[PDB]
Enzyme design. Sequence first.
Site, mmCIF file in Angstrom:
data_model
loop_
_atom_site.group_PDB
_atom_site.id
_atom_site.type_symbol
_atom_site.label_atom_id
_atom_site.label_comp_id
_atom_site.label_asym_id
_atom_site.label_seq_id
_atom_site.Cartn_x
_atom_site.Cartn_y
_atom_site.Cartn_z
ATOM 1 N N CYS B 110 0.813 -1.221 0.000
ATOM 2 C CA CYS B 110 0.000 0.000 0.000
ATOM 3 C C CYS B 110 0.847 1.272 0.000
ATOM 4 O O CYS B 110 0.493 2.252 -0.667
ATOM 5 C CB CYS B 110 -0.951 0.013 1.203
ATOM 6 S SG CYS B 110 -0.169 0.043 2.869
ATOM 7 N N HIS B 145 -2.842 1.175 7.119
ATOM 8 C CA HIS B 145 -3.134 1.174 5.695
ATOM 9 C C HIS B 145 -3.133 2.621 5.221
ATOM 10 O O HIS B 145 -3.478 3.530 5.974
ATOM 11 C CB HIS B 145 -4.473 0.472 5.416
ATOM 12 C CG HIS B 145 -4.866 0.453 3.968
ATOM 13 N ND1 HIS B 145 -4.016 0.028 2.964
ATOM 14 C CD2 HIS B 145 -6.033 0.781 3.359
ATOM 15 C CE1 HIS B 145 -4.632 0.126 1.800
ATOM 16 N NE2 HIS B 145 -5.859 0.574 2.010
ATOM 17 N N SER B 162 -4.090 -2.855 -1.923
ATOM 18 C CA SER B 162 -4.605 -3.535 -0.740
ATOM 19 C C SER B 162 -4.831 -5.010 -1.072
ATOM 20 O O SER B 162 -5.010 -5.377 -2.229
ATOM 21 C CB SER B 162 -5.929 -2.916 -0.263
ATOM 22 O OG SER B 162 -6.526 -3.740 0.732
#
Lengths: 36, 246
Positions: B110, B145, B162
């Site tokens: 990510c 994330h 992702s």
Amino acid sequence: QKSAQQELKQRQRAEIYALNRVMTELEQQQFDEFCK
Amino acid sequence: FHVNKSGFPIDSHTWERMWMHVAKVHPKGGEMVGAIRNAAFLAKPSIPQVPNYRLSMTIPDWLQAIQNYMKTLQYNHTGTQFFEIRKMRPLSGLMETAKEMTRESLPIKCLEAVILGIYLTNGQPSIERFPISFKTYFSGNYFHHVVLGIYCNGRYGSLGMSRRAELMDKPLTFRTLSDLIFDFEDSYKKYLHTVKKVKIGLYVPHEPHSFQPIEWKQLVLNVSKMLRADIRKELEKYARDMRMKI
């Protein structure tokens, strides 16, 4: 020199994508055990 | 969760630790690793062409070409991140790493994708780029994330990468920052993740100063402690501050 290392780079890349396919399929199967 | 700090080709210590990790994670571990390492007839994976904006493309097509490029590199499921990203390094150096990723052409996670997305959209001023970071909780553990938020022609979207299809790219159809964030929140809950913290950075300059880094946490919201109305209130006020250059 800068030639043996190119051969090694390409070898490592081919193994990385073979590994990533296998790991991607495993995650897809464990994730499917979650959704089921 | 290892990170390759040896460059390319990957050094011995980094390479072997990757293989031992996957051997352990996979149910047929040792049989699997032996089938790949030193295999003689492995396909040479093709090298995808790097996207580049052309006047003949619409902006949504161009950004989809960027997202498809990242999908072609693939999400990195090997446990070893291949390109080191130091988040407070100046953009000047991060752009050299992004260029390196297009040259070596390997799977990415990510944070790598956020840097790639900045590199690939630099030079189109009609697109504004800003990072969106999430801290979530799932069954006893915190997860982190990040995606690239984008703003263009009065609409918000994102690019990213992702393990989940709903936690990455969003089309340019969100009318507010809040709608974009709340869509990430609602997607996270399909996976029984609780969002604990949302962090919004600043616009990433198309022409940064030599020493300018990405700013990752201009706005930090402890979302699990707040009501919907308060979250939207704060997001809209920060977003209008961005759009005004205050």
